[PDB]
Amino acid sequence: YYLQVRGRENFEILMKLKESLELMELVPQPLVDSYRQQQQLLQR
Amino acid sequence: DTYYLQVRGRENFEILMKLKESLELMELVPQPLVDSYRQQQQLLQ
Amino acid sequence: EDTYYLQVRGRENFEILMKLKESLELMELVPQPLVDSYRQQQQLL
Amino acid sequence: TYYLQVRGRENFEILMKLKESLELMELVPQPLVDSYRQQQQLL
Fold first, then answer.
1. Containing domain of residue B41, as a range?
2. What is the least distance, in Å, from the CA of A28 to any CA of chain C?
3. Which of A24, B37, C38, D5 suits a disulfide with D21, CB 3.0-4.6 Å?
4. What is the CATH number of the domain that holds A34?
């Protein structure tokens, strides 16, 4: 999908997020699951 | 000053769109209100 | 809206999330007619 | 480690997912991150 955005700072923020969303897909699921388990102790 | 982004994954697109909306809409908020808002947040975290 | 809390590891991460939290909360302050116009433009863009 | 508050359940869920992607991204081996960035340029 393509997205357009006004403002350089906005673009740079969205670019970092796009990257993190796409990169985390490379993380082995057992590590992702362990991470989420840790979240249960940090947030409701 | 517009930029274009490409993203893979419909969920990913949807999240980014929500943030695009908030970042762009925030631009419409008169600066007095942004200032007051930020002052308030200093006691909250 | 109800209040929620999250913890974040990393200053860089914290700063990004704070910027997004700000935008998500501040968009609530934009008068509805301007939100409507914004959405109107986005449909064309 | 920092903490923030946010108003609204949908806002919380959005931030939580971004928090997850930001924090997990750091587990990706650097050579793999470099490979991904190369891919974004070369294609």
1. 1-45
2. 20
3. A24
4. 4.10.170.10
